[PDB]
Amino acid sequence: RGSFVEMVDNLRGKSGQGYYVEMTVGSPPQTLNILVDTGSSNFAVGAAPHPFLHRYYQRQLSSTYRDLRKGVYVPYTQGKWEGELGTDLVSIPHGPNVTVRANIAAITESDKFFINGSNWEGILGLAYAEIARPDDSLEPFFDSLVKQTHVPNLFSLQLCGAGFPLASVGGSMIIGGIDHSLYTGSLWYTPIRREWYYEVIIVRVEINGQDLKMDCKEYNYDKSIVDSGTTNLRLPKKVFEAAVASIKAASSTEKFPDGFWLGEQLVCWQAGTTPWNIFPVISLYLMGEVTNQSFRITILPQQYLRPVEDVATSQDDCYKFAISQSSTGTVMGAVIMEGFYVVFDRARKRIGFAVSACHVHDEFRTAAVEGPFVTLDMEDCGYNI
Ligand SMILES: C[C@]1(c2cc(NC(=O)c3ccc(C#N)cn3)ccc2F)NC(=N)OCC1(F)F
Ligand code: NA
Ligand code: NA
């Protein structure tokens, strides 16, 4: 409890390519790097020689592979994978000293799934069975881990982002606990509304302290989730309109092309001259643990202006605006998570936020987690189908 030195710094990544953990599958163990995704619930790995892959799971080499004789086809908004289901022995070398029998989708065909130039070969879906494919009888990895071992039913993520001048990203996934060195201040908890995605309720939104003043249902239309497998802070379309209008207004000392705000083009500045000061902070108030109580998390432009390194077109420091409109609800992606240590307290159906000890900031502003606030009618903020 509180100290897990063996798991600290067990995540790696490259800007724009996500955060992965080393895992082993099979007997003898095959090592793979696996994207950590709190926005899905399948453990799925490359199992054939796709050209983007550094390596892939070779089931024929594992003495402990058990075939489920069942396939799954998994389409996403863009791209898809198809695989064959089975079980095998799985470990996380920089994790708990346990080995468990987990479901594994051996990916045999894919499209726009793997990233050319990335160093990961599969995905670890850490969300709940309700969103597992093909259905909720396919037990997620974390559920198997907790069922088969004494590992406590929680994990925490510290995602440490990037800045110019371009280093790899990193962080820590603490499995079965919390490491107090990874944050400062106190943890503040918000309820997991429903166990499917890591669904939460946003009750107020401010841009540099100025409330957008929308019906709070709009903030959670049709849901709000905490998602390590998405880069952007995605906002429902109506909310995005309001937020960007407000952010533009706050930054109006400099003018940027409309396309920049829509993620249609980059903006670049002479190296070391990024004008962070002109950009506002973004605050989300989350439903608290107690009736009529909330707390707020605040991120900086260092989180939502993402460095883009691979730009042959330009010699300068180029950035993408990583707040974007959504039709799937609010997605608190890496843009949010990189500000915080985030505790997925599954045992107590709650998500904790604390200021990350590694987050990117400057001399004038830091990311923040502050409470309590008085917020009435927070249960009305939830959207119902
Ligand atoms: C399953 C999936 C998914 C995510 C990824 N995710 C990434 O590539 C990725 C890239 C950068 C960062 C950062 N920072 C996080 N994730 C890749 C393939 C998927 F298939 N997970 C998800 N949370 O939303 C999109 C998705 F549903 F499509
Ligand atoms: Na257990
Ligand atoms: Na601390």
How many structural domains? 2
Rg over CA atoms: 21 Å
Output the CATH topology of the largest domain: Cathepsin D, subunit A, domain 1
Query: Helix- and strand-based class?
Result: mainly beta
Name given to the CATH homologous superfamily of the largest domain: Acid Proteases
Strand content: 35-45%
Order of strands in the sheet with the most strands?
Answer: 2-3-8-4-7-6
> What profile does the largest beta sheet have?
6 strands, mixed, barrel
Extended strand count: 26
Count of alpha and pi helical runs = 5
Approximate helicity band: under 10%
Ligands: the ligand C[C@]1(c2cc(NC(=O)c3ccc(C#N)cn3)ccc2F)NC(=N)OCC1(F)F, sodium ion
What is the name of the CATH architecture of the largest domain? Beta Barrel
Distance between the termini: 39 Å
Q: What's the CATH C level of the largest domain?
A: Mainly Beta
Overall morphology? globular
PDB class: hydrolase
Keywords: hydrolase
Assembly: monomeric
Entry title: crystal structure of bace-1 in complex with chemical ligand
